[PDB]
Amino acid sequence: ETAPFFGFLGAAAALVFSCMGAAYGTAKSGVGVASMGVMRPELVMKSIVPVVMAGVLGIYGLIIAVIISTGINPKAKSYYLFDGYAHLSSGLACGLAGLSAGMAIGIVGDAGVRANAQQPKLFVGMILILIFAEALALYGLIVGIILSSRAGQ
Amino acid sequence: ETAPFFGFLGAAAALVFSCMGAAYGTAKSGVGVASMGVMRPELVMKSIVPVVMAGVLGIYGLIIAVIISTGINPKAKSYYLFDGYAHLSSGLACGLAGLSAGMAIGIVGDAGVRANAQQPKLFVGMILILIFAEALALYGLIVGIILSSRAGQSR
Amino acid sequence: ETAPFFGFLGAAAALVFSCMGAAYGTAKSGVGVASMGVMRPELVMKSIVPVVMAGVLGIYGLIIAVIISTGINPKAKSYYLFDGYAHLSSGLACGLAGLSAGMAIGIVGDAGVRANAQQPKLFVGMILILIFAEALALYGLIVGIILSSRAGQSR
Amino acid sequence: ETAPFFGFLGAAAALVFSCMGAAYGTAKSGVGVASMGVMRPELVMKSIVPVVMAGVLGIYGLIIAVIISTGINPKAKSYYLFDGYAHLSSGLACGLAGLSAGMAIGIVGDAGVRANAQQPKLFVGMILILIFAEALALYGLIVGIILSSRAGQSRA
Amino acid sequence: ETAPFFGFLGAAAALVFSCMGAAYGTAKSGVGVASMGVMRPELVMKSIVPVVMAGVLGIYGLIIAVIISTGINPKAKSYYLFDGYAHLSSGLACGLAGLSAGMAIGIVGDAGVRANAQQPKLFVGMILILIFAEALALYGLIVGIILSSRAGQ
Amino acid sequence: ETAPFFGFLGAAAALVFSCMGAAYGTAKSGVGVASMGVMRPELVMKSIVPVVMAGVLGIYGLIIAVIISTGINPKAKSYYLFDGYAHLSSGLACGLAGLSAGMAIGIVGDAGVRANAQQPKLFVGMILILIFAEALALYGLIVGIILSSRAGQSR
Amino acid sequence: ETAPFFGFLGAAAALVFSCMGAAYGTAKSGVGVASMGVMRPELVMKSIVPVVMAGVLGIYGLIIAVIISTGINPKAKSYYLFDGYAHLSSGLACGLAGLSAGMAIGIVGDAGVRANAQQPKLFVGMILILIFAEALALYGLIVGIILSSRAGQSR
Amino acid sequence: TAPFFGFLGAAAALVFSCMGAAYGTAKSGVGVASMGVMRPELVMKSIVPVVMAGVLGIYGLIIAVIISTGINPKAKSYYLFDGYAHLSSGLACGLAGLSAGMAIGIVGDAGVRANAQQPKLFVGMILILIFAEALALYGLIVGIILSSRAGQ
Amino acid sequence: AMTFNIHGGYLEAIVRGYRAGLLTIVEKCTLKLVDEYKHMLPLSTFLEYITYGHMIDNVVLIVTGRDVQELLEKCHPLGMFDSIMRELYRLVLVDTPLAPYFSECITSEDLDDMNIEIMRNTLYKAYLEDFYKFCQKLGGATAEIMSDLLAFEADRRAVNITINSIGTELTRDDRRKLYSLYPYGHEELAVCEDIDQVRGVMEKYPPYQSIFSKLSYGESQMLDKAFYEEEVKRLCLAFEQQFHYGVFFAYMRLREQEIRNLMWISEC
Amino acid sequence: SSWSRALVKISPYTFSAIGIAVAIGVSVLGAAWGIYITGSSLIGAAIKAPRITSKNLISVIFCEAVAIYGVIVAIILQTKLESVPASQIYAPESLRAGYAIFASGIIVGFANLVCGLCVGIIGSSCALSDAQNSSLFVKILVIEIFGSALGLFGVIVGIIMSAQASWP
Amino acid sequence: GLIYNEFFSVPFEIFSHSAYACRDLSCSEATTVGLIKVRDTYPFGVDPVWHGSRSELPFLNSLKMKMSILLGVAQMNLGIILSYFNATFFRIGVNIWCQFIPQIIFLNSLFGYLSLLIILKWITGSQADLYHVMIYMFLSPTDELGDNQLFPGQKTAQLVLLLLAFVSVPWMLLPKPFILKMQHHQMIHTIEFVLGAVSNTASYLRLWALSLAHSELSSVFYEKVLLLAWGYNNILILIVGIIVFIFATVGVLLVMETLSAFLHALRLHWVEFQNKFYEGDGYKFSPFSFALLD
């Protein structure tokens, strides 16, 4: 009965948490880029793309929200609490993973913006750190997809 | 019914909130005026205008409380849950508006005491902020009176 | 039924809030007068006005609470929940107004002690500020008295 | 029958939050005006724009509250469940929008008043920023007017 | 039946709050007295006036607690809720008044210790301030006694 | 049935709160003594008075707790809720009084230990202040004894 | 019945609070010991006594927990709600007393160790303070034992 | 039905124990790195206090294992007493481990600095830390005793 | 604890690396250290206070005039920043922590800041105000170091007053009224008119005991050198610099001490 | 009673799913926090000198191991799910399975968070220590590896608890 | 300790054989209507049966409280009496008759009702009073009632004592300033004396509390030792228990208890006994009798 409400709430949380995490990471990276621009403006665009990389987390959250929305329909089946609660849990897990990854990526980018300016040879290390951080987001997306798969009971 | 359990409580809370806001504003204004008078005793008498203007909140709150109290009378006519709920809402709105106006007037007067002490040219001009705050308080009181006028609308 | 609970709670809240406000005001006044007691002991004697005003506000709150308590005579007339709710609201309003007035008067006196120590010409302004602050307590007491009187209109 | 309580509470909350936002804006506006005083007393009159904006926000909040209160007609059109929840939601939305607009207007006006001394010709740009901020108040008033009757009179 | 569970609690709360206020005042009073005695041992004995007056609040609280305890006489009359609630409210009011008076007296004594140390000419003013503060405690005790007197239903 | 739970909880709370107050007082006195005795050996023993003055409160609390525990005897009298409520009230009063006395005694003892290096003429005043503060513990013990005595007379 | 769900909870809470207090004491004691021994390694051995004094509270709490655990045996007798409630009260009292004593002992020992190298008289002063503090822990343990023993009757 | 509390006890016992274990290991580790900046040889031996803190996790892990094994529903009827006892047993072990680790972290962090200053006091720091670490062992004893009360 | 990783970690690591790398040549080293400090731009307030430390002395020096134009030659950004004669003093009262207090305390301008002794008194008052402001920002272990530095400055000023400045109206009352455990127990140094009396006063603090020793060196100098030299000798404590704590002030002090040592080297 | 009955009548499937999701979420959050903590120090050291990038990467790998373990635990929990039949929606077996799943998830999440925080702090200290001296890197790495065992122990406990699932 | 009939936390053979004997109860439980019938009172100390009985706590607590009250009354009376001797020795003015007499009379009379009630309950065996109804009789400030009163004149005696106490308040404040004005600082004695009398009266219970705490600690130690000796009678276990008991006696019973008792006794002596004498000031005269050389 309330399973559709639980699923809708879970999808909303999955969208909102990922959006907030991506926004925080992007804001931190933008502040770092603005600080670094006055020193070596030639390198302002050399790290702007990893700064805006929070769009990846935003898109992942949007995809998770769309997937959660797709799976809820009375016509297909009168899904019970076992389905709505599962969808809500999958959405919440995906959103929390996205928010954590976004915050970590924002901090890492804030560090790397100054690090690359101080040492151009550290760009590869910063990229490696960013990829290691985004591994968590990839794992979270995989877990969310796996959890949402079983929700179609 | 249990109408005064909310209506009378709201009537009391209106005056309580209005008094609290007026007290905060008057305290800030008095601290500023004392500092200004210490700086110059000449401006102490002339700088009491914001302090007096902050007192309109108390009068408005007292009037609203009296109106709300007169609006509750089981002997004249039984008041339902709606009749008390509307009065409580009007009292809460009036009290919150009075508190906000009092805080704003207090901050404005605290700034204006120093502003007048420094530049006498802007002293009279600064009264626009106090006028705006008083207008906000009057608008809140009008809204509260409009809300309270629906006491007899029930049936 | 359970109306005496509400009435007693309201009276106790009124007394407690009035006492707390008076205590805060008196503490602020004493903190202010501590400096005047050494800088100019001749003017220190006249500096006890805010303490007297705070005591007056506390006395007014206590009087309102005593009136509210005296209004509860179960053996004379049964106390309906309406009367208890009205009395509790009146007590809460009186206590909140007294506490706010006491805090404002305490801050005003704390500022005015230094203000008068710097310049004796600020005594008139300090007195005016104190009177304006006490007006709020007077209005709160009047509202509480009106509410207490209206509390007996149920049937 | 308990819906009118929620409706009146929503109207009161709209008025209260609009007043709170207006006061929060006006406090910063007055602080900025006082700060700009003495340094440039000539521009005292030109600095009253944030005061006008705060007054406009308060007037809009009062108008929204009066519009909500105009729907308190229990003598006809039995309130049902919609007339309380819809009115409460509209009042809450209008009040929150007013509070946010007041905070933004106060911040922008204080910043402009403080910056009015440096590059005094930037008063037009400051007023433009203030208007772009205060447009949120009009948007919130429009939303409240839309919600004033969309879910209120369609209970049937 | 549940009236004593409120009356005894009210009496205990009255005693506890009076003791707490007395201790709060006495801490500041003793700190100021020790400071003054270190600075000027001559007036140390005469500076214990706020310290001594602090115990008056505790004495009044103990008296109110004794009166409340004597109020609960189940054998004399079946304790209805109308008496237990009134006793609890009276105790709460007395305790709150005592705590407020204790805080005010502590602040006043802390100021007055330094005031007298700088110049003993303000002893009269300090005593007057202390008396004005204790007037609140006296009013609270009177109100509590009056409220407790109404236990006759 | 549930009354003995309330009584045992009250006794336990009395003991625990008295222990906490005594511990706070003893810790404050110990910090003060450690600070003072580094300079002179006088504070080693001549100023160890608060160390036992604070433990006196803990002893009083333990005595009150033992009395309360001995008060309960289901095999001798089937305790109603009255006995449990009275025991809980007595325990709470005793524990709160013990905590307040412990805090006040600790603060005063720390101040006295700090002032020990000053003129020794203040030792008498410090002892008098400590005794006046500790009078609160005796007052609390008396209140608890009175409550325990009145506890068993339930109908 | 549901009495074990409270009795075992109280027994566990006793040990938990005792361990928390012992750890809080030991952390401060170790910090002070390291600070003292940084400059005077000779007195490090003499400064370790408060650590053991605080650790004794852990043994006391363990003994109280063992007694409480042995005091519950459904196979022996029907543990009514009174027995479980009394056991829980004893556990809570013992644990809270142990935690307070541990915190106080840790503060006092840290202060004494910091002052240990300043004067050799600290070796006696801190020992006396620690003994006076552990007296409170012993009193709490005795009270807990008495309550646990009294829990055995349950009519 | 009641077995929910019993299952929660085992999880709480490990969670609260590891919470204090990480805090103790973090403080101990930070001091070790500070000493290792200058004193090369002293840092290697000072890792024992960190190793001592990590042992507390093992003690909590074993306690959790026993609780899990005793929650067999199909073996014996897990009445409310068994669930209440297991939850109580876990609560003491988890709370005690958290406190015991916290003291070790505070003591260990100072100990690294003390050893780097005067190597003589290294024995004294170990003795105090060892005595403090006994509280976790004390908590382990209480956990076994409480868990053993699952007979009926 | 997690706030360090939340923010400020990279700056802390950079500062630690720069300090670990540390060990007209003196002028060049000072310029390099100042450039390293400037390029590093919560911790902002700490950096502002650290700069204001030497900025108080820089502003005091600039307050002259009287060959005032020579102050541009020593415009080291570490302490002589442009942002940090009553008419000019009021203008300079902004952008400095101790300036607003010195505006009232030194309102006599050159009258209370005479270049012979009263200028040193104004400098000491400004240093006391700056030390109070720095101690106000409590929350870290640097409070002990700041208190030790302020105590050393106050004790050195008191020793100088008792040695020869007593004739310059730097009496026992002036030992704390004008001459900037000391914040609570500085009264013991008001009567330390002799080197033996100075050692006896130092005996009141066992850590300060034996620090004076024979007092042939360190205490022999006037102004703020007597107990400040004790802090310089004991600066090995500052060399500890435990991690995850504010060490920017420690690094700045170490760089300043290294610059001073290089200057003292000079021609061997 | 009625409130107690309602509390006892809550659906266990919702609690089990909540715990399963929370385990993965907390593991991811702890791993990300530890990764950021290590990365700040690594970036600082690289700014000081890029010579120790290979040594620093070990801390990042160890931090990511916590996320890997959490993901594995989440996959196991997802495998542990069942069909949740309507008839046995309140059966004792279903309630026991849900409670066990929730407990295992909470334990795994808390242990992962603690291990991630400890590993992040250790790596942050170790990077600075290595920048101070490369000779101490071995001991710091050993200490970090020893501290990483908290996550492994938590995962083992969660796996042991996972055997309790018996949902029909 | 000999008076208390407790030796090393254990009773022993009193001068009599057995003060109280179980009324019948050859097989019946102790808790019964018959309970224990006393042949005669043991003169050397308390009844040996009472110490180890379940009812040990209430009877011992009541006896200790009564003894503490009586001892405090006696000490206060002695301190107040010393005032007249001090005034005569120093040939003080009429202030003794002006202030010392009311000061020594008011507190004496105020505590006299309680002391006499305690004695009468002890003497007349008025079990209708016990420890509690004595306070209950003392509780009522108003007249009338007196149903539980045991003194034949208590109905009028209480009113007379209340009137005397009320009248004594001004008599302790006026005459000394009156004599000072006639012959031409009382604020220090004013207010302070009234509260101080009650404070000193209350503080006497510290002795009873300390005695009860010492008894409880000794009982706990003895119980632990007995439990070790009975069930753990094995040689190693018995030796370990004996060592533990010795250590506990050295720590708590020997050191802590004695230190606390000494501190409490000194506090009581200064607080009350010294309050009515000494008066402070002065200095210790000492000649150059080679004191440093000595």
Interface contact flag, C51 E147, Cβ < 8 Å: no
Q: Count the helix, strand and coil residues of chain D and give each as a percent rounded to the nearest 5.
A: 80, 0, 20
Check if A111 contacts I (Cβ < 8 Å).
yes
State the Cα–Cα distance between residues I172 and I193, nearest whole angstrom: 9
The total number of residues shown for chain J amounts to 168
Check if F85 contacts E (Cβ < 8 Å).
yes
Q: Is J2 exposed, middle or buried (0-12, 13-18, 19+ CB in 10 A)?
A: exposed
DSSP B69-101: HHH--TTTS---HHHHHHHHHHHHHHHHHHHHH
Task: Give the CA distances from residue D1 to residues B82, B151, D153, in Å, rounded to whole numbers and listed in that order.
Answer: 8, 16, 16
Resolution, angstroms, 1 dp: 4.0
**Would you tell me the crossing angle of helices K56-89 and F49-71 to the nearest 10 degrees?**
140
State the Cα–Cα distance between residues B72 and B83, nearest whole angstrom: 9
Interface contact flag, H33 I244, Cβ < 8 Å: no
Cβ-proximal residues to D146 (8 Å cutoff; 6+ apart), any chain: none
Q: Which chains touch B (3 or more CB pairs under 8 A)?
A: C, D
Please choose, from the candidates C110, C134, F22, the residue with its C-alpha nearest in 3D space to the C-alpha of residue E107.
C110
Query: Does the CA dihedral G91-G97-G100-G104 come out positive or negative?
Result: negative
Please choose, from the candidates K5, K3, K8, K1, the residue with its C-alpha nearest in 3D space to the C-alpha of residue K218.
K8
State the Cα–Cα distance between residues E104 and E53, nearest whole angstrom: 12
Which residues from A are below 8 Å from J76, CB to CB? none
State the Cα–Cα distance between residues K134 and K155, nearest whole angstrom: 14
How many Cβ pairs within 8 Å bridge chains I and J?
50
Hey, of E35, E46, E69, which one would you mutate to test binding to chain F, going by the most F CBs within 10 A of its CB? E69
Helix (H) or strand (E) run with residue K22 in it: strand K20-22
CA atoms within 13 A on the CB side of D23: 27
Interface contact flag, F97 E19, Cβ < 8 Å: yes
Check if D65 contacts B (Cβ < 8 Å).
yes
Please choose, from the candidates D75, K183, E53, K291, the residue with its C-alpha nearest in 3D space to the C-alpha of residue B155.
D75
Q: Which two tokens stand for residue B108?
A: 């404005």
Q: Which two tokens stand for residue K44?
A: 């050397």
Question: First vs last Cα of chain D: how many Å apart?
Answer: 16
Task: Give the CA distances from residue K142 to residues E59, E66, K151, in Å, rounded to whole numbers and listed in that order.
Answer: 20, 14, 17
Interface contact flag, H91 G9, Cβ < 8 Å: yes
Cβ-proximal residues to I39 (8 Å cutoff; 6+ apart), any chain: none
How, if at all, do strands K36-38 and K20-22 pair?
A: antiparallel
Which residues from F are below 8 Å from E38, CB to CB? 115, 118-119, 122
Enter the DSSP assignment of F120: G
Task: Give the E-state strand segments of chain G in sequence order.
Answer: none
3-class secondary structure, K26: coil
Check if F101 contacts E (Cβ < 8 Å).
yes
Helix (H) or strand (E) run with residue K36 in it: strand K36-38
State the Cα–Cα distance between residues I83 and A43, nearest whole angstrom: 30
Among the partner residues D9, D29, D44, nearest to B89 by beta-carbon distance:
D9
Interface contact flag, I13 J125, Cβ < 8 Å: no
Residue of chain I nearest H110, judged by CA positions: I242
Among the partner residues E45, E55, E70, nearest to K139 by beta-carbon distance:
E70
Q: Which two tokens stand for residue B41?
A: 């005793």
Enter the DSSP assignment of C88: H
Check if A132 contacts J (Cβ < 8 Å).
yes
Interface contact flag, K252 G135, Cβ < 8 Å: yes
Cβ-proximal residues to K283 (8 Å cutoff; 6+ apart), any chain: none
Cβ-proximal residues to G95 (8 Å cutoff; 6+ apart), any chain: G13, G14, G15, G16, G17, G18, G61, G64
Taking phi over 0 as left and psi of -120 to 50 as alpha, with beta for the rest, I127 belongs to: alpha
Among the partner residues B2, B19, B59, nearest to C100 by beta-carbon distance:
B19
3-class secondary structure, K38: strand
State the Cα–Cα distance between residues I245 and A24, nearest whole angstrom: 26
How many Cβ pairs within 8 Å bridge chains B and D?
146
State the Cα–Cα distance between residues K50 and K56, nearest whole angstrom: 5
Residue K90 identity (one-letter amino acid)? F
**Would you tell me the crossing angle of helices E81-118 and E49-71 to the nearest 10 degrees?**
180
State the Cα–Cα distance between residues C109 and C27, nearest whole angstrom: 10
Strand partners, B132: none
Please choose, from the candidates K124, K125, K169, K126, the residue with its C-alpha nearest in 3D space to the C-alpha of residue K147.
K126
Which residues from F are below 8 Å from E4, CB to CB? 81-82, 85-86
Task: Give the CA distances from residue H152 to residues G76, G78, G100, in Å, rounded to whole numbers and listed in that order.
Answer: 11, 12, 35
Residue of chain K nearest F150, judged by CA positions: K132
Task: Give the CA distances from residue K50 to residues K15, K23, K54, K81, K125, in Å, rounded to whole numbers and listed in that order.
Answer: 15, 15, 8, 38, 18
Interface contact flag, I243 H34, Cβ < 8 Å: yes
Radius of gyration over every alpha carbon of chain K, rounded to an integer in angstroms: 25
State the Cα–Cα distance between residues H60 and H90, nearest whole angstrom: 9
Q: Which chains touch K (3 or more CB pairs under 8 A)?
A: E, F, G
**Would you tell me the crossing angle of helices J92-132 and I9-21 to the nearest 10 degrees?**
30
Is residue H69 within 8 Å of residue H148, measured between CB atoms?
A: no
Enter the DSSP assignment of K99: I
Cβ-proximal residues to B59 (8 Å cutoff; 6+ apart), any chain: C139
Residue of chain F nearest K258, judged by CA positions: F52
Question: First vs last Cα of chain F: how many Å apart?
Answer: 16
Residue K163: count other Cβ atoms within 10 Å of its Cβ.
10
Q: Count the helix, strand and coil residues of chain A and give each as a percent rounded to the nearest 5.
A: 85, 0, 15
State the Cα–Cα distance between residues K24 and E79, nearest whole angstrom: 43
Interface contact flag, K192 E55, Cβ < 8 Å: no
Using DSSP, how many helices (H) and how many strands (E) does chain B show? 7, 0
**Chain F: closest CA distance from residue G52 (Å):** 17
For residues K178, K179, K184, K190, the Cα torsion angle rounded to the nearest 10 degrees is -60
State the Cα–Cα distance between residues K242 and K236, nearest whole angstrom: 10
Please choose, from the candidates J104, G7, J151, the residue with its C-alpha nearest in 3D space to the C-alpha of residue H68.
J104
State the Cα–Cα distance between residues G129 and I121, nearest whole angstrom: 46
State the Cα–Cα distance between residues K258 and K261, nearest whole angstrom: 5
Among the partner residues B96, B101, B155, nearest to D75 by beta-carbon distance:
B155
Q: Is H41 exposed, middle or buried (0-12, 13-18, 19+ CB in 10 A)?
A: exposed
Q: Is F152 exposed, middle or buried (0-12, 13-18, 19+ CB in 10 A)?
A: middle
Q: How far is CA F74 from the centre of its chain?
A: 28
Question: First vs last Cα of chain K: how many Å apart?
Answer: 41
Q: Count the helix, strand and coil residues of chain B and give each as a percent rounded to the nearest 5.
A: 85, 0, 15
Task: Give the CA distances from residue H119 to residues A79, G34, J129, K31, K127, in Å, rounded to whole numbers and listed in that order.
Answer: 69, 12, 20, 68, 74
**Would you tell me the crossing angle of helices H80-117 and H3-38 to the nearest 10 degrees?**
10
Among the partner residues G85, G133, G143, nearest to F66 by beta-carbon distance:
G143
Interface contact flag, I10 J128, Cβ < 8 Å: no
Residue B113 identity (one-letter amino acid)? V
Radius of gyration over every alpha carbon of chain B, rounded to an integer in angstroms: 19
Q: Which two tokens stand for residue C148?
A: 């207490």
Enter the DSSP assignment of I66: -
Q: Is F127 exposed, middle or buried (0-12, 13-18, 19+ CB in 10 A)?
A: middle
Please choose, from the candidates D137, D155, D142, the residue with its C-alpha nearest in 3D space to the C-alpha of residue D57.
D137
Please choose, from the candidates J111, J117, J105, J114, the residue with its C-alpha nearest in 3D space to the C-alpha of residue J154.
J111
Check if K206 contacts F (Cβ < 8 Å).
yes
Instruction: Name the experimental technique.
Output: cryo-EM
Is residue H56 within 8 Å of residue H133, measured between CB atoms?
A: yes
Which residues from F are below 8 Å from G20, CB to CB? none
State the Cα–Cα distance between residues A63 and A144, nearest whole angstrom: 11
Strand partners, K20: K38
Residues in H 46-65 with any Cβ partner in J closer than 8 A: 47, 50-51, 54, 57-58, 61, 64-65
3-class secondary structure, E90: helix
Among the partner residues E55, E66, E70, nearest to K195 by beta-carbon distance:
E55
Is residue F119 within 8 Å of residue E36, measured between CB atoms?
A: no
Check if J40 contacts H (Cβ < 8 Å).
no
State the Cα–Cα distance between residues C136 and E85, nearest whole angstrom: 32
Radius of gyration over every alpha carbon of chain D, rounded to an integer in angstroms: 19
Residue of chain E nearest F80, judged by CA positions: E1
Strand partners, K36: K22
Is residue I128 within 8 Å of residue I146, measured between CB atoms?
A: no
3-class secondary structure, F37: helix
Phi, psi at K271, each rounded to 5°: -65, -45
Which letter, b or e, does each residue of K87-115 get, where b requires 16 or more Cβ atoms within 10 Å of its Cβ?
Answer: beeeeeeeebebbbbbbbbbbbebbbbbb
State the Cα–Cα distance between residues H64 and H87, nearest whole angstrom: 11
State the Cα–Cα distance between residues C96 and C80, nearest whole angstrom: 25
Residue I137 identity (one-letter amino acid)? K
Interface contact flag, I242 H33, Cβ < 8 Å: no
Helix (H) or strand (E) run with residue K20 in it: strand K20-22
Please choose, from the candidates H49, H106, H122, H62, the residue with its C-alpha nearest in 3D space to the C-alpha of residue G23.
H106
Residues in E 21-50 with any Cβ partner in F closer than 8 A: 22-24, 26-27, 29-31, 33-35, 37-38, 41, 44-45, 47-48
